[PDB]
Design a protein around this ligand. Structure first.
Ligand code: A1BBL
Ligand code: CL
Length: 167
């Protein structure tokens, strides 16, 4: 039993809700919140910009030190950093950015990072400003993630379409 509330159950391990991931994280304080990161951990917009703003830029400060030490992530890769005031940990996961020409096949590799964590609050990878089809992202999530994932979908209109078309 966990403290996630109001989710629709899609499969044995995948749950979905119309919610602002920032507000969800502040309420639940989950062990792991997933950020929709880029390889530079430049949290300028989308989910990443919103999560960073909620940390008063502390996420960006930590991220800049991480990059200065380690260099960029790989598309499809991830790193675990602090969750600041939002979660115990933040799993920064890089889905492919379609608006950069990146190979959508890497979306499965990106979701595989979730399997290293027993429970996660997460957005749909590569959705929004990363340019992928969210229906496809949800399908890849369900077919790749085996741990317990709670998906926050900000757009109410998009949430209803994902549920109604879910196979
Ligand atoms: O959910 C999508 C990604 N964007 C966010 N998701 C959750 N919480 C958020 N807070 C700020 C941005 C944001 C992906 C599916 O298409 C709709 C947008
Ligand atoms: Cl977005």
């Amino acid at each position: 039993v966990n403290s996630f509330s109001g989710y629709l159950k899609l499969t044995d391990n995948v749950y979905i809700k119309n919610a602002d991931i920032v507000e969800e994280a502040k309420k639940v304080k989950p062990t792991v919140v997933v950020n929709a990161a880029n390889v530079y951990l430049k949290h300028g917009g989308g989910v990443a910009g919103a999560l960073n703003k909620a940390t008063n830029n502390a996420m960006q400060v930590e991220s800049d030190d991480y990059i200065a030490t380690n260099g960029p992530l790989k598309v499809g890769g991830s790193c675990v950093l602090s969750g600041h005031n939002l979660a115990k940990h933040c799993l920064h996961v890089v889905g492919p950015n379609v608006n950069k020409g990146e190979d959508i096949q890497l979306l499965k590799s990106a979701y595989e990072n979730f399997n290293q964590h027993e429970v996660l609050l997460a957005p749909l990878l590569s959705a929004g400003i990363f340019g992928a089809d969210p229906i496809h992202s949800l399908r890849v999530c369900v077919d790749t993630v085996r741990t317990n994932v709670y998906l926050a979908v900000f757009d109410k209109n998009l949430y209803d379409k994902l549920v109604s078309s879910f196979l």
